[PDB]
Design a protein around this motif. Structure first.
Motif, PDB file in Angstrom:
ATOM      1  N   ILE A   1      14.268   0.546 -22.690  1.00 42.00           N
ATOM      2  CA  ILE A   1      14.119  -0.690 -22.781  1.00 42.00           C
ATOM      3  C   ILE A   1      14.921  -1.525 -21.766  1.00 42.00           C
ATOM      4  O   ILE A   1      14.578  -2.549 -21.102  1.00 42.00           O
TER       5      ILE A   1
ATOM      6  N   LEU B   1       6.548  -2.519 -18.151  1.00 45.69           N
ATOM      7  CA  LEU B   1       6.939  -2.947 -19.343  1.00 45.69           C
ATOM      8  C   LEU B   1       6.337  -1.867 -20.635  1.00 45.69           C
ATOM      9  O   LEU B   1       6.492  -2.210 -21.892  1.00 45.69           O
TER      10      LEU B   1
ATOM     11  N   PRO C   1       9.041   0.221 -22.312  1.00 43.88           N
ATOM     12  CA  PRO C   1       9.860  -0.573 -23.010  1.00 43.88           C
ATOM     13  C   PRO C   1       9.015  -0.735 -24.507  1.00 43.88           C
ATOM     14  O   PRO C   1       9.708  -0.832 -25.611  1.00 43.88           O
ATOM     15  N   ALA C   2       7.831  -1.308 -24.444  1.00 44.22           N
ATOM     16  CA  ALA C   2       7.322  -1.366 -25.537  1.00 44.22           C
ATOM     17  C   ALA C   2       6.997  -0.393 -26.394  1.00 44.22           C
ATOM     18  O   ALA C   2       7.135  -0.301 -27.810  1.00 44.22           O
TER      19      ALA C   2
ATOM     20  N   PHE D   1      10.095   0.476 -28.175  1.00 48.19           N
ATOM     21  CA  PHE D   1      10.660  -0.489 -29.252  1.00 48.19           C
ATOM     22  C   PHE D   1       9.799  -0.220 -30.326  1.00 48.19           C
ATOM     23  O   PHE D   1      10.633  -0.080 -31.610  1.00 48.19           O
TER      24      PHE D   1
HETATM   25  C1  LIG Z   1      15.646  -4.562 -29.158  1.00 44.48           C
HETATM   26  C2  LIG Z   1      15.371  -5.514 -27.982  1.00 44.48           C
HETATM   27  C3  LIG Z   1      16.498  -5.614 -27.222  1.00 44.48           C
HETATM   28  C4  LIG Z   1      14.261  -4.760 -27.376  1.00 44.48           C
HETATM   29  C5  LIG Z   1      13.198  -5.853 -26.626  1.00 44.48           C
HETATM   30  C6  LIG Z   1      11.978  -5.121 -26.212  1.00 44.48           C
HETATM   31  C7  LIG Z   1      10.835  -5.845 -26.620  1.00 44.48           C
HETATM   32  C8  LIG Z   1      11.089  -7.248 -27.307  1.00 44.48           C
HETATM   33  C9  LIG Z   1       9.838  -6.160 -25.444  1.00 44.48           C
HETATM   34  C10 LIG Z   1       9.833  -4.866 -24.375  1.00 44.48           C
HETATM   35  C11 LIG Z   1       8.514  -4.900 -23.808  1.00 44.48           C
HETATM   36  C12 LIG Z   1       7.818  -6.035 -24.063  1.00 44.48           C
HETATM   37  C13 LIG Z   1       6.247  -5.920 -24.273  1.00 44.48           C
HETATM   38  C14 LIG Z   1       5.635  -5.413 -23.233  1.00 44.48           C
HETATM   39  C15 LIG Z   1       4.715  -6.304 -22.546  1.00 44.48           C
HETATM   40  C16 LIG Z   1       3.857  -6.786 -23.309  1.00 44.48           C
HETATM   41  C17 LIG Z   1       2.371  -7.168 -22.840  1.00 44.48           C
HETATM   42  C18 LIG Z   1       1.944  -8.418 -23.203  1.00 44.48           C
HETATM   43  O1  LIG Z   1       0.515  -8.548 -22.879  1.00 44.48           O
HETATM   44  C19 LIG Z   1       2.307  -9.059 -24.345  1.00 44.48           C
HETATM   45  C20 LIG Z   1       3.937  -8.954 -24.800  1.00 44.48           C
HETATM   46  C21 LIG Z   1       4.286  -7.485 -24.639  1.00 44.48           C
HETATM   47  C22 LIG Z   1       3.423  -6.535 -25.808  1.00 44.48           C
HETATM   48  C23 LIG Z   1       5.800  -7.320 -24.874  1.00 44.48           C
HETATM   49  C24 LIG Z   1       6.086  -7.880 -26.046  1.00 44.48           C
HETATM   50  C25 LIG Z   1       7.678  -7.828 -25.948  1.00 44.48           C
HETATM   51  C26 LIG Z   1       8.150  -6.390 -25.798  1.00 44.48           C
HETATM   52  C27 LIG Z   1       7.850  -5.206 -26.633  1.00 44.48           C
END
Ligand SMILES: CC(C)CCC[C@@H](C)[C@H]1CC[C@H]2[C@@H]3CC=C4C[C@@H](O)CC[C@]4(C)[C@H]3CC[C@]12C
Ligand SMILES: CCCC[C@@]1(C2CCCCC2)Cc2cc(OCCCc3nnn[nH]3)c(F)c(F)c2C1=O
Ligand SMILES: CCCC[C@@]1(C2CCCCC2)Cc2cc(OCCCc3nnn[nH]3)c(F)c(F)c2C1=O
Ligand SMILES: CC(C)CCC[C@@H](C)[C@H]1CC[C@H]2[C@@H]3CC=C4C[C@@H](O)CC[C@]4(C)[C@H]3CC[C@]12C
Ligand SMILES: Cc1ccc(-c2ccc(F)cc2COc2ccc(CCC(=O)O)cc2)cc1
Ligand SMILES: Cc1ccc(-c2ccc(F)cc2COc2ccc(CCC(=O)O)cc2)cc1
Ligand SMILES: [K+]
Ligand SMILES: [K+]
Ligand SMILES: [K+]
Lengths: 412, 412
Positions: B113, B155, B158-159, B162
């Motif tokens: 992430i 991303l 990372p999703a 997560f």
């Molecule tokens: C524990 C912490 C530090 C990790 C944070 C990572 C999370 C919060 C982030 C990383 C990648 C992110 C996602 C990747 C991109 C998208 C696609 C978009 O259309 C909607 C939001 C969404 C689904 C994001 C939501 C938040 C997300 C999941």
């Protein structure tokens, strides 16, 4: 006949690895006077091996400036030359471990002679096929005088080492004298390829930056038996004792990356690097290689606050030297700014003050930290940590700081 | 605004070091079933870490294809991305050491992430300043759609990680499923920069070639006390016991250098490398990284001749795979020779047969050695050593051998 950029890039990678091999015995030394003597000897051996391998790399670079292109046989001969060069650090260490045993001196002389013989074979093959030479040589009035000259330059070292190998059985100090003359004479009695210097510096910075992560991966992965037994099954408890190693790695990587950022910014504005800049870059990289040791010392246990003061001062000195040699390179290039620097970074140029601040961020920071270790010693380590936080941010907002200084000068 | 070749070269150096960090625990495994299990686990961990780091490097390369030029803040963000990537091998090893502990999975997901977040910040900064993008992207009328697509690509990982970190506290196998999906999806549902592939391969070859010399310098320098006590002051006697290590280093360096020579000759004739060639090169480098282990095994003590047969067969298999993947790369490039190869190395070209022989020298040699280990086992190790002598010479006189084969075809 084929292009020779990738072969020389591989050569630079191998030579950087061989130059930085000898810092591993230093960073692996355990943190009483016997330990200090061992650390001093290992540091001296690392410095001498780095200087020797950088001399060999400089000879290789100014050899392949003459040999313009490459071929299959030239590639194989270059591989053989690299293999012969890879034995310089180990054989020099064996030499210095047994100073009075002629076998070590004989092996060092044999290694140098082998490198010189392979290089002489490379030169002979290149001159036998003139299409492999650079166009200036291919067109030179007396091309074979250039040979009589390149053979002499290449084989001077092997001859002196051969005589030293002779004298090792009869008079060892004389062997030492000619062996030091081998490195002394080419400088005590010309431009150096900027691509080769850039590649060597990139390799050295990449190796030095990632020493501690390599060590951590090798050793500091928790063992399940010890995790369930010493730390009662708590993995976070096991990783807590590893935390100082992570902090040392973070500090060393941040410092080395920022120093490489300053070096990269400096060399993006260099038209052609003279050999004075090459020598200063060699010294800068030699002192950069000592950063992981400084970070390991600072992150280590503090038996007494005086030990913390001493270790902070030593780390500050290492950083100060490693960055002040880059600053000296920058000033030397400014001396000949007409032919060594782009018009943007000339005196009074658009980027002159920005580059000056970029290359002086670290020396001044180390100087104030060292001064605080004597004036505000009570907070010494604290301000040191503050420096580790302040310097990257100062690099992030360097343009803003330079603009603020320019406004301050304007209102003054 | 400044050129970004040197920054990406530094990135390739760091990424090659991080990819090859995990071969050190393998080459340090000394060679009953417990030792074999440990070696198998270490080999699997090395392969998985190499694949993961190569996936990260591929993502980085196809990220900076979009981001044409670089800047100071971009350089610092790239340094942060490199630092976050350097924790992939250690954290993955901690993950696989404690499969049922959610902390390891959580740390691996956090590392991925963090890499993705830094890359997303890089993309956002690049799109906020359009002059940093490549001209294609710059002149495109769909810059917002391009930004959305690159943010999604960056991303996605990372999703999924997560969500896997969520499921680690509730259903660990599901976390495993999405974590394997992270690497699977981009390939299971485009050209790769040739300079980046060349630099990564050069770094990997330079690291793998010089593993044994680094180990020898670290450990195999004779100690004066043991020299005067265990070898009665005879330094040659002390170095004799180190001789197998030197032989293993010579063999490993020769093979890795010749494999790199074949790779360099192959890539000197490549116009643009497709990602299929990238995958094949990744597999070739992954199997090249196992050569020092094979050479260490062969040079080691032979308790029984059957052990020698097994070790020779294992070394031959490793060499065969490492070279057959280069051959597969060459054939795949031949499939699209119109746009991937220079006209000289096309079917029926001037250098086609020469390059074919250059890339098939090692696979056929390993195949005949492996066949002799079953047909002429009595001489197995001998012929293996003969191979180590025959292959470099075959590389020295490859053009002569190809001409002889052409004459044989001509008279036939
Ligand atoms: C524990 C912490 C530090 C990790 C944070 C990572 C999370 C919060 C982030 C990383 C990648 C992110 C996602 C990747 C991109 C998208 C696609 C978009 O259309 C909607 C939001 C969404 C689904 C994001 C939501 C938040 C997300 C999941
Ligand atoms: C802008 C601030 C963060 C930037 C930085 C990047 C800046 C670009 C080059 C790569 C490194 C730098 C930095 C420095 C750290 O020093 C802290 C030492 C440990 C400690 N703990 N308490 N005192 N010291 C650092 F720790 C970092 F984590 C990072 C990063 O990720
Ligand atoms: C031309 C023949 C030698 C070439 C070679 C260089 C040629 C340029 C490219 C890199 C390799 C390679 C090589 C291989 C060796 O392995 C053979 C083990 C012998 C043994 N085994 N068991 N007992 N003796 C080798 F040993 C070498 F010494 C050398 C070299 O110096
Ligand atoms: C025997 C092996 C181990 C080493 C061989 C090294 C010796 C034979 C080689 C290496 C360098 C060579 C010398 C290089 C320089 C010169 C100057 C030239 O005007 C006369 C020949 C002379 C003096 C060469 C003689 C032979 C030489 C000394
Ligand atoms: C003056 C001198 C000194 C030492 C050696 C020597 C000796 C042993 C050895 F193994 C290699 C070498 C060096 O290898 C070459 C050197 C030069 C030449 C070309 C010279 C021409 O054209 O006359 C070709 C090969 C040779 C000449
Ligand atoms: C959807 C989502 C996913 C993750 C994060 C996030 C969160 C924390 C973090 F540190 C970095 C990021 C990502 O950093 C950027 C994201 C987008 C942009 C461009 C603006 C746009 O079009 O959405 C620029 C930078 C934010 C939004
Ligand atoms: K170890
Ligand atoms: K390395
Ligand atoms: K190492």
């Amino acid at each position: 006949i084929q292009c020779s950029q990738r072969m020389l890039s591989f050569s630079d990678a191998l030579l950087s690895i061989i130059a930085t091999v000898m810092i591993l015995p230093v960073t692996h030394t355990e943190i009483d006077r016997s330990v200090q003597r061992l650390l001093a000897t290992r540091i001296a051996v690392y410095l001498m091996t780095f200087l020797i391998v950088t001399v060999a790399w400089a000879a290789h670079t100014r050899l392949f400036q003459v040999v313009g292109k490459t071929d299959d046989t030239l590639a194989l001969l270059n591989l053989a030359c690299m293999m012969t060069i890879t034995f310089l650090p180990y054989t020099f260490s064996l030499m210095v471990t047994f100073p009075d045993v002629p076998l070590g001196i004989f092996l060092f002389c044999v290694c140098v002679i082998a490198i010189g013989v392979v290089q002489a074979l490379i030169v002979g093959y290149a001159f036998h096929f003139p299409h492999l030479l650079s166009p200036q040589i291919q067109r030179s009035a007396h091309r074979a005088l250039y040979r009589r000259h390149v053979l002499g330059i290449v084989l001077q070292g092997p001859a002196l080492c051969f005589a030293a190998a002779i004298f090792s059985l009869f008079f060892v100090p004389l062997s030492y004298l000619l062996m030091v003359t081998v490195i002394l004479l080419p400088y005590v009695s010309e431009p150096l390829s900027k691509e080769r210097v850039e590649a060597f510096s990139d390799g050295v910075y990449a190796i030095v930056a990632t020493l501690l992560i390599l060590d951590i991966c090798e050793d500091n992965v928790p063992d399940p038996k010890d995790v369930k037994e010493r730390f009662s099954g708590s993995l976070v408890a096991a990783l807590s004792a590893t935390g100082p190693r992570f902090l040392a790695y973070f500090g060393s990587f941040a410092t080395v990356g920022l120093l490489w950022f300053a070096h990269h910014s400096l060399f993006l504005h260099v038209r052609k690097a003279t050999r004075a800049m090459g020598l200063l870059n060699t010294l800068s990289l030699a002192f950069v290689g000592g950063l992981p040791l400084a970070y390991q010392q600072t992150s280590a246990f503090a038996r007494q606050p005086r030990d913390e003061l001493e270790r902070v001062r030593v780390s500050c000195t290492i950083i100060f030297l490693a960055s002040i040699f880059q600053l000296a390179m920058w000033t030397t290039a400014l001396l000949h700014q007409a032919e060594t620097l782009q018009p943007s970074v000339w005196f009074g140029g658009r980027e002159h003050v920005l580059m000056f601040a970029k290359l002086a961020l670290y020396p001044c920071a180390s100087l104030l930290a060292f001064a605080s270790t004597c004036l505000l010693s009570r907070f010494s380590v604290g301000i040191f940590h503050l420096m580790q936080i302040a310097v990257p941010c100062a690099f992030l907002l360097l343009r803003l700081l330079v603009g603020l200084a320019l406004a301050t000068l304007r209102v003054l």
